[PDB]
Design an enzyme around this catalytic site. Structure first.
Site, PDB file in Angstrom:
ATOM      1  CD  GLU B   3      -2.917  -1.115   0.099  1.00  0.00           C
ATOM      2  OE1 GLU B   3      -3.536  -0.051  -0.086  1.00  0.00           O
ATOM      3  OE2 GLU B   3      -3.093  -2.134  -0.599  1.00  0.00           O
ATOM      4  CG  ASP B   4      -1.048   4.872  -0.431  1.00  0.00           C
ATOM      5  OD1 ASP B   4      -1.096   4.111  -1.419  1.00  0.00           O
ATOM      6  OD2 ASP B   4      -1.968   5.660  -0.128  1.00  0.00           O
TER       7      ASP B   4
END
Lengths: 308, 49
Positions: B3-4
């Protein structure tokens, strides 16, 4: 004592720790606090001849003593006030109401009208608002009450009263005292009165403490007790020392009147230990906590004291 | 870093990458009250406070 001396047959009794009383037949004596305690039927006895000794103790209309006496209504109620008015004409109103309720107006009529200050027209002659010409209105009330009061001046029969002296001494505020005074004055204004509370109403207490005992101006005096009080911070103490030494060398029995017992104890320590000059003078002590028997003993000693 | 998030080279952190200083200043002053009381700096004693 007077009752049993002049008139033995009178049936008088003490309402302090007595009994029977109302159960038996004539005269009853009680304490004002005792009167408060006996809010029972006693108030309903309707004592035909009611007389109060310390009328000065019922000066305040709102005081519980005065109101408790007021509830006890009888066709003949009398007051033997030790002194007349001292603080406010409302005191006279309360006294007259207790003795003569219907012969004088209610509290409002009295305060808005029967008041020597501008209320009654202190400038009744239409003069400056200052209370200087407020006559023919308060004088009328005085003449109306005169048919209800008696007064004998000591000079009337007791002319044997040597001269009295209104010698108002004056002192100088020390630099320390002046500095603290100015500091408090500058910092006093928080709400500018803070409802008094040590700023104006009782800030007067702070000012008085600065004036008298700046050295020990604190509740925790024990921290400064070893080194204080210091008379150098109060010229009033110096004046007291001078007068006491003069009267000791002149052999005059001197009376000293003091404020709250903290000042009393500070002065005692000063005279006893701080200044050897005053330590040579033998002294006596009194306070509100002294025992009644001890109080009488000290009074008797003073009346024939070898002290200074 | 799915994810980020991200991955960071550790050896770059060890050589001074993105290191930052942090400063925090604490304040305290003797309380205004001087009318027979105060609140003074000192070293408190376990037996006297």
């Amino acid at each position: 004592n007077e009752f049993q001396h002049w008139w033995p047959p009178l049936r008088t009794v003490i309402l302090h720790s007595m009994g029977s009383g109302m159960a038996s037949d004539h005269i009853l004596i009680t304490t004002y606090v005792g009167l408060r305690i006996h809010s029972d039927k006693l108030l309903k006895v309707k004592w035909q001849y009611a007389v109060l000794d310390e009328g000065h103790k019922i000066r305040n209309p709102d005081s519980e003593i005065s109101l408790t006496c007021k509830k006890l209504k009888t066709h003949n109620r009398i007051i033997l006030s030790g002194t007349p008015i001292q603080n406010n004409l409302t005191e006279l109103w309360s006294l007259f109401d207790f003795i003569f309720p219907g012969k004088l107006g209610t509290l409002p009529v009295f305060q808005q009208q029967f008041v020597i200050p501008i209320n009654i027209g202190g400038y009744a002659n239409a003069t400056n608002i200052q209370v200087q010409t407020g006559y023919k209105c308060a004088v009328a009330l005085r003449d109306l009450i005169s048919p209800y009061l008696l007064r004998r001046v000591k000079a009337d029969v007791a002319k044997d009263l040597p001269q009295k002296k209104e010698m108002v001494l004056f002192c100088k505020l020390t630099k320390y005292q002046r500095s603290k005074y100015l500091e408090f004055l500058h910092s006093s204004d928080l709400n500018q009165i803070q409802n008094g509370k040590r700023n104006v109403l009782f800030g007067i207490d702070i000012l008085r403490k600065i004036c008298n005992h700046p050295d020990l101006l604190d509740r925790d005096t024990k921290r400064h007790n070893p080194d204080y009080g210091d008379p150098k911070r109060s010229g009033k103490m110096q004046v007291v020392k001078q007068l006491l030494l003069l009267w000791h060398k002149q052999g005059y029995k001197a009376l000293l009147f003091t404020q709250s017992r903290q000042m009393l104890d500070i002065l005692e320590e000063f005279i006893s230990t701080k200044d050897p000059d005053l330590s040579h003078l033998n002294y006596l002590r009194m306070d509100g906590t002294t025992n009644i028997k001890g109080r009488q003993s000290l009074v008797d000693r003073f009346n024939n004291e070898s002290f200074d | 870093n799915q994810e980020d998030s991200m991955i960071m080279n550790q050896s770059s952190i060890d050589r001074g990458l993105f290191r930052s200083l942090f400063f925090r200043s604490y304040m305290d002053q003797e309380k205004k009250y001087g009318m027979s009381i105060t609140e003074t700096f000192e070293k408190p004693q376990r037996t006297n406070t």
